Structure 1
Amino acid sequence: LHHAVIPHGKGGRSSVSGIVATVFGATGFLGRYLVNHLGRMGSQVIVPYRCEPYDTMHLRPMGDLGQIIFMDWNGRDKDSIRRAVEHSNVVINLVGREWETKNFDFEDVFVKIPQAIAQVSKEAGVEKFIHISHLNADIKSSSKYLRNKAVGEKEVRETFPEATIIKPADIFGREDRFLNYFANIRSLGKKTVKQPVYIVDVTKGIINAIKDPDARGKTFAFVGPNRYLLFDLVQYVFAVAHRPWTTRDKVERIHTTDRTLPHLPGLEDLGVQATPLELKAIEVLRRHRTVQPAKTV
């Protein structure tokens, strides 16, 4: 343990937590929340960004001076990844897009990029690697999203033996795409069961997995405290919002039930209390305003 990485302080903004974390794709939603949680305890965060620097502007007040280092990177440029991760002691992978594009399809964003990041981090001698996948990721799924997630997480686990794979079920928050997708529809009802998990709980679970040394090589499953049927969930969403972009893959994903994985550790094994939807739905959907809770199975 080097002297510059030994923690000090009282865990405040100006303290030292001794974490050198490279967060890939930190300009998104989960990346923004992870950078906010990492910067408040006094950690060194290295953010490789592909978009405009202005879109990274909101990442500046997340920490103290010099604790967030923005640098350019490219998905198919291995040397940029070697540049980014050769000084960090933990790498977090959050790269993912909900829809395919002309330059980056689902395979190149879910298979090639995570495997390349893991291989580069393995060659650079990093200590802790975290890869974010989906809970319902299966090889034999009907949609491309879960297929590519399953293949990518298999390749990541094969490439890095100590890779901690984190599987959120479905995440709701201020800048999410689950409750904001439902409330803005003004697809249909089915028999699917889902158990959403609060974004702050996922971020705290990731941070608690960073802190402990016993979580290396595991495969967690971040699921919410209560399971909801889709019809009651969308009725609750429309009732909170005081109301009377899409693709085929999202349509398939909405009509897929959330699987149960009892053999894998969850949020309670990391000391995280799963916040229910009824305590945060008002905060999430107060923007849409110009109530009985949903029934749980």
Structure 2
Amino acid sequence: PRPLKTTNPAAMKRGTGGRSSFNGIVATVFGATGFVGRYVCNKLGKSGTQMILPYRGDDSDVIRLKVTGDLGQVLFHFYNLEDPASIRDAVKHSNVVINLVGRDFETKNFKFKDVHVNGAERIARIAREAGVERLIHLSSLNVEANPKDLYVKGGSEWLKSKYEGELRV
């Protein structure tokens, strides 16, 4: 018997399943401006899920996601990955946190460890401290503890970073 958290009858599941309905899920899709984020935002908005949607860059890269949900089901929030208080402000009223934060190349501000390892662990521990019921995190298929190079030297840092980030999550 799985118990309910708050039993607020303005917060339970209602409706048939369109945009105007509510399925009792408050999603916080981190990195929702990306490739998987667009499809998961439209799939969440077609069912009636309110999304908080924290964005890091400009508002023009994230303002296209207002057409996925209904009125009031789409929010926006400015955050940095190194800043923990903004993440705690983002996930303080949520029960489902979806983590799509990842980067295929090293950046001058964020390395692989600063995105996949440290950032996902920080998001997971902030969501655990904020009372989030469920967290969804994405990794790679071929993650190993010590993955070997095949063609390029210095490769498979991404797979090791995703495996270490999954272990810290």
TM-score, structure 1 as length reference = 0.52
Q: What is the CA distance between 1:13 and its match in structure 2?
A: 1.3
SS at match of 1:99: coil
Instruction: Report which structure shows greater RCO (CA 8 Å, sep ≥6).
Output: 2
In the alignment, the residues of structure 2 paired with residue 51 and residue 70 of structure 1 have an alpha-carbon distance, to the nearest angstrom, of 12
Looking at structure 2, the residues matched to 84 and 28 of structure 1 have their Cα atoms a distance apart, in angstroms, of 18
Asked if residue 127 in structure 1 is aligned to residue 145 in structure 2, the reply is: no
Match of 1:25 among 31, 34, 39: 31
Q: What secondary structure, in the 3-state scheme, does the structure 2 residue paired with 1:63 have? A: coil
SS in 2 for 1:148: helix
Q: Deviations over 1:10-41 (max 9, x none)?
A: 00111111110101000001111111000011
Letter in 2 for 1:95: V
1:102, CA displacement in angstroms?
Answer: 0.5
- The equivalent residue for 1:149 is 162
Aligned letter for 2:97? V
User: Counterpart of 2:75 in 1: which secondary structure?
Assistant: strand
RMSD of equivalent CA atoms: 0.8
Consecutive aligned runs of 4 or more in structure 1 exceeding 6 Å deviation: none
Distance 1:81 1:57 in 2: 20
What does 1:16-55 align with in structure 2 at a 5 Å threshold?
A: 16-55=22-61
Query: Structure 2: which 5+ residue stretches go unaligned?
Result: 1-6, 149-155
CA distance in structure 2 between the partners assigned to 1:120 and 1:50 by the alignment: 17
Q: In the alignment, which residue of structure 1 is the partner of 2:143? A: 137
Alpha-carbon distance in 2 for matches of 1:12, 1:129: 24
Q: Displacement, 1:109? A: 0.4
Give the distance between the partners of 2:64 and 2:91, measured in 1 at CA: 23
Bigger radius of gyration: 1
Give 2:3's aligned residue.
Answer: none
Letter in 2 for 1:97: R
Structure 2 letter corresponding to 1:107: K
Partner of 2:69: 63
- Distance in 1 (CA, whole Å) between partners of 2:53 and 2:87 is 11
> How far apart in 2 are the matches of 1:41 and 1:5?
15
Which residue does the alignment assign to 2:152? none
Number of aligned residues: 156
CA distance in 2, matches of 1:4, 1:45: 17
Quote the residue 2:14 is aligned against.
8
Matching of residues 128-277 of structure 1 within 5 Å:
128-142=134-148, 143-156=156-169
The amino acid that maps onto 1:12 is: G
Question: What do residues 173-211 of structure 1 show as CA deviations (whole Å, max 9, x unaligned)?
Answer: xxxxxxxxxxxxxxxxxxxxxxxxxxxxxxxxxxxxxxx
